């Protein structure tokens, strides 16, 4: 049963792209403890048209993380984060790290540091020393979260999904020292948290339309596609916050629940504006829309144009 796959090149080899796929042996649920694991290597011959099995290096734990890092491959098998190199017979592990809490579920590698995502614990920032081949964790989080997917937004800001239907974004402090040697000293503060309500498993920050602005497009397990766009103006963010505060009082949800309670299911809301609740201003009552526009000192077509401007700037 395969769980991870990666396609990159090795520093010891030439320009031949190798496809490494980690698999497990005798696994199922929590009652049936995982037995062993293996990592098959492919050649990607005919310019990526045919794959040839070069070697299959076994492992003691089930590998759930494979990512290239400075010409080598980072292999996370269970709670052991190991840096393996390309070998003629098997993948020679050049480094190893056993500082994981339960199991390494995901791994996103920056150009200088490495960010591994645990199963029940939040993702931690780890620096890899190239001189001594020793990976040292220099940052961690204060709140545990069942992370399913993550994406690096910047060199110090990382946004990760939650298994409970939430979305969080953690940013490292600027005074954090990467060169070092309850759990960790330096902690990472969560700058944004929002309960989306659906199980997110894919996050990607890119441009959906050429000429527009890049947004945090996220997927859902229920067949839904969403996008998170940052506010460019503080006055526009305050106007959107006032519009959301007016809409939470003027148009309640039909399920009898509170919007703030729905957004604060797993984690409290921090710098998040639900555009779907703001989109109901055109569908609500005209007298209530006129009252909300008089409270916002504008017109209802002006509010509709202000709502459509962000959608035209950030989406298709």
């Amino acid at each position: 049963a395969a769980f991870s796959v990666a396609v990159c090149r090795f520093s010891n080899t030439g320009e031949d792209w190798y496809v490494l796929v980690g698999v497990a042996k005798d696994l199922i649920l929590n009652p049936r403890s995982v037995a062993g694991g293996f990592v098959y290597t492919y050649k990607l011959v005919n310019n990526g048209e045919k794959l040839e099995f070069l070697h299959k290096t076994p492992v003691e734990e089930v590998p759930a993380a494979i990512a290239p890092f400075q010409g080598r491959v980072l292999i996370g098998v269970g709670k052991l984060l190991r840096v393996y190199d390309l070998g003629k017979k098997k993948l020679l592990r050049k480094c190893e790290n056993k500082h994981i809490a339960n199991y390494i579920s995901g791994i996103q590698t920056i150009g200088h540091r490495v960010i591994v995502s645990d199963v029940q614990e939040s993702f931690i920032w780890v620096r890899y020393k190239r001189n001594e081949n020793q990976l040292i964790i220099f940052a961690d989080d204060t709140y545990p979260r069942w992370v399913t997917t993550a994406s690096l937004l910047d060199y110090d800001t990382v946004a990760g999904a939650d298994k409970f239907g939430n979305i969080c974004v953690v940013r490292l402090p600027p005074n954090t020292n990467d060169e070092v040697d309850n759990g960790a000293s330096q902690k990472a503060e969560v700058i944004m948290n929002y309960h989306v309500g659906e199980t997110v498993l894919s996050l990607q920050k890119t441009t959906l339309i050429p000429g527009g602005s890049e947004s945090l497009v996220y997927t859902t397990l229920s067949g839904g596609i969403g996008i998170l766009v940052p506010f460019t103006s503080h006055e526009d963010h305050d106007f959107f916050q006032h519009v959301e505060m007016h809409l939470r009082s003027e148009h309640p949800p039909l399920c009898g629940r509170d919007h703030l309670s729905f957004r604060s299911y797993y984690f409290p809301v921090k710098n998040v504006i639900d555009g779907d609740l703001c989109e109901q201003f055109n569908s609500m009552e005209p007298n209530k829309q006129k009252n909300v526009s008089e409270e916002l000192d504008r017109t209802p077509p002006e509010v509709s144009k202000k709502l459509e401007d962000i959608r035209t700037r950030y989406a298709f």
């Binding site: 339309i209 050429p210 000429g211 527009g212 460019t232 526009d236 401007d309 035209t312 700037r313």
Partner: peptide
């Protein structure tokens, strides 16, 4: 708001240009 609005219009300009590309 107004000053920003002037800027906002420019903001729109960029997206519109993007569409053209």
């Amino acid at each position: 708001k107004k000053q920003d609005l002037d800027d906002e219009e420019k903001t729109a300009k960029f997206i519109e240009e993007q569409v053209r590309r």
